[PDB]
Amino acid sequence: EQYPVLSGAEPFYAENGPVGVLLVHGFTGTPHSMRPLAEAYAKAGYTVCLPRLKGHGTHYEDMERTTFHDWVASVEEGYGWLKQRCQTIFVTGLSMGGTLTLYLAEHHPDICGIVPINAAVDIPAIAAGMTGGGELPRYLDSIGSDLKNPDVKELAYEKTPTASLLQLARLMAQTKAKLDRIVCPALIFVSDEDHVVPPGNADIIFQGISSTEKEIVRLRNSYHVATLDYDQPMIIERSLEFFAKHA
Ligand SMILES: *[P@](=O)(CCCN=[N+]=[N-])OCCCCCCCCCCCCCCCC
Secondary structure (H helix, E strand, O other): OOOOOOOOOOOEEEEOOOOEEEEOOOOOOOOHHHHHHHHHHHHHOOOOEOOOOOOOOOOHHHHHOOHHHHHHHHHHHHHHHHHHHOOEEEEEEOOOOHHHHHHHHOOOEEEEEEEEEEOOOOOOHHHOOOOOOOOOEEEEOOOOOOOOOOOOOOOOOOOOEEEHHHHHHHHHHHHHOOHHHHOOOOEEEEEOOOOOOOHHHHHHOOOOOOOOOOOEEEOOOOOOOOOOOOOHHHHHHHHHHHHHHHH
């Protein structure tokens, strides 16, 4: 990985109480989208790990070299960091961060609870792009930022490698097929007007998981990047309530 990490894309750690929260940012995104959550959780006395996914926060040419196994490894590392100083671990994530949240819970039953936010397990737009017939460039122009608050700017790549999109699709496929192995408590956030990840994904995750304790909280004044959007304080308040309930 050959480019410098952008300002605001650095990983974030905090060693506080014996209860830990792993925060996973999204595809082409940076820890910048999860930072206000991580700080709010850290102030509440929680040990937080906000890792920077491999190939992210630098340059899109760096991400092109990475597989989803790399992104998983970045999260498994954060999970291992939390596992060495916590006995109870929650995982939360936005978009693909939500996908990796689900992925982790499918492999680690010790997860006390998960809080996916606009998690993606099925994006029909990807399949639609490679059946168009036309030539498919090596790098595609990224989808515009999906935020209701106009004063907020997201830290994400201007371009998206085709190879990375294929890696994302494979991750979502393996994640969606293994949903029934999640039994831990789940707090699913979903924006009604998500223009990137179809809101129906929350339904798929809800019906897929074997968790007896699951709930869908619907965000009404936020687009895709809800964690920076208007419903940020609500997400924080609900999550802390969720954490304290199962800690
Ligand atoms: P989340 O992972 C990101 C949220 C925070 N990160 N940021 N910013 O969003 C899920 C990613 C899904 C994006 C897919 C949209 C691309 C559709 C266009 C596809 C055209 C090219 C596809 C052909 C490749 C086979």
